[PDB]
Design a protein around this nucleic acid. Structure first.
Lengths: 97, 98, 98, 102
DNA sequence: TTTTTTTTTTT
């Protein structure tokens, strides 16, 4: 089924890079997309080489554009309430700089 | 400063039947959840929101299990005590019925 | 050549059956034109698909079939019965059958 | 109309300076061309169109070589040239435009 | 070369 997202925002913090147990790179960051002035804070996830590149070139405030899909996943917080997360599985990231 | 790109396009089935209510300011608002299938081994559940006439059409022609595609922007709302809502503000809703 | 954002998504009906060709090296390529209605006027976009996706288009899509495409927007050069033409097509990375 | 689903998002460089004309109604119309790079022909030439205030800002802010991001629809066209052959044209109806240069 | 839900904003 069709599922496509395209965003252009500024990173709110430095991209946070980590590695899975079996070595897969995982870069995460939060784009602040200006509204059509407030903005929306969307969370994005990157994998493998695209994640390592996000780490070496993006930082707080950098302008960037993502292209991916919307994901959801259940979560149980310390307060007990079940939370719904929505992320952007960015398959491509353009550095606008 | 100025605006920034923000576009979303989904095609999924409604988990429930769309719920229509009228805003205190008089505007119509219909909500519904699309279940778009994942491309691998099973589905994501995106919250959609549409307004005014597009909302009145959704409530009349879409029900649970209906296939539909939306075209809007991704916005994060904030307000069961403190919920961080991530939803699609649907500007268009296409009915994929017979 | 650093990459840039290039995304297209459409839902339309084939103007005719998809024509299946084969690359000199043996790759499957299927083309078709989608009629994306503005109203019930329409736009007629040309789409190309490759490898397994061209196989499925050829097997599961005929004229008037509702289909969704997701891909890039690329230009192309070829010859019709004379001078060259400069077309703009949609490289369907994924095609949903409806 | 824009009833069935149809959306385009592009980011490219202007190949030529924008062209601003005015329609019978006196409304603003801006036409420009983007060079959308490939990821290993190495770029794609896409024609764009915008209207009204969105077209005024294009002619003022954007010049040849500027980096721009458009969001709109696909719209087709067919005309007969002087050679007597029916040409077919696709171009983006840029609803939204974002300026990206420094 | 074409396929088969939407309306005004009113001097």
């Amino acid at each position: 089924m069709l599922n496509r997202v395209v965003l252009v925002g500024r990173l709110t913090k430095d991209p946070e890079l980590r590695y899975t147990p079996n070595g897969a790179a995982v870069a995460t960051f939060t784009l602040a997309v200006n509204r059509t002035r407030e903005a929306d804070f969307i969370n994005c996830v990157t994998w493998r080489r695209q994640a390592e590149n996000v780490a070496n070139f993006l930082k707080k405030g950098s302008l960037a554009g993502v292209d991916g899909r919307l994901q959801t996943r259940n979560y149980e917080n310390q307060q007990g309430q079940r939370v719904f997360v929505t992320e952007v599985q960015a398959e491509s990231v353009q550095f606008l700089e």
